[PDB]
Amino acid sequence: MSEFAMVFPGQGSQDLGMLADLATAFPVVEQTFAEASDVLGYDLWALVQQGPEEELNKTWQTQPALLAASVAIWRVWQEKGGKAPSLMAGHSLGEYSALVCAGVIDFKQAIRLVELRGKLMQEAVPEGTGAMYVIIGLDNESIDRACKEVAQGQIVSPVNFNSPGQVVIAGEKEAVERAGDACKAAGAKRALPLAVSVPSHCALMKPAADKLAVVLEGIEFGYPQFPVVNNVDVKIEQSAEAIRHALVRQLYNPVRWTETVEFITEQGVGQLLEIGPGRVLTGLTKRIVNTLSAAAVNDTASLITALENN
Amino acid sequence: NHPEVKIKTILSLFLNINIDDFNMDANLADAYDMDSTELADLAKEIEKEFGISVTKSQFSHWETGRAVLDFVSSSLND
After folding, report:
1. Three-state secondary structure call for residue A68
2. A20 to chain B, minimum CA–CA distance in Å?
3. Which partner from A56, A189, A230, A248 sits 20 to 30 angstroms from B8, CA to CA?
């Protein structure tokens, strides 16, 4: 018996007309966004397809769209009668997608939490105060040094460790911009700025995380059906209290995705399926392990091929 | 000037193939098996060559070799 795991993408994987091919093939896709639209008070499907992206890149509107997109793929997978995954894991927002798919949080309840989470993060760091930079083709020490050299009494840190030779930094805008130039000077292959509204997973988010800690106490947390590996600790939590505290700590601590993928590999998992839009986490997989296959389930063609193998 | 000749030259040298073997009509995704980041690295070579700006939203949508050309022509025009 082979084993596979589902991985859920974070922020930056959203684009215009995502799940347009799958929506024609499956009515349940548009039903998921319709349920999310009742919570939000606007047609979330209409925002995603029609655009404009500039609205879709606003974090409080970005994350509900990714959550509704990612869960809609899982519902199609479960409707067709696909194989049950051995593990679950999720990047940045993906924890919320994975926890909803795992049966920890309710879908409609999660949309309010995820929307509100975006607003709390935006209150901490206003629009244009901070930015995020993917730094490709450089070791972690050299990136970690480069941030400390150019900080100048401002918050800069490497936050997402996506793969070996790919680290994301976040902090204050100018400090990140000045840090990004220092990494290119050190021999980085590229310092690509992400089009993300808020610098996540850094010390600037702790004011928002303190507010988020009080939110999660109001929300109900069920027992997980599938094992969910968190970003912050690289650990599977069964109890509700431990999952809540992980989601708070996630917001102001780095994402350990390299170790998350390696941990999945240790539990006999031979393949990863990216349950969400784009193909971001698929491209990371080969760089982390090389012998671990992966594919992105974002449209009908990919849905059937992925379903047929496993 | 001569965008197709240079777009043919750059993508041929990037993938380690002859110019004759490369096809503008073909799908970069798995016709030549270049991933997301390799496309981001190509995007930077296009910025340096023509003197135009490109962002993740823009360079990620390039599926064909012609799709890269059409972007460059519109950028130089505007």
Report:
1. helix
2. 16
3. A189
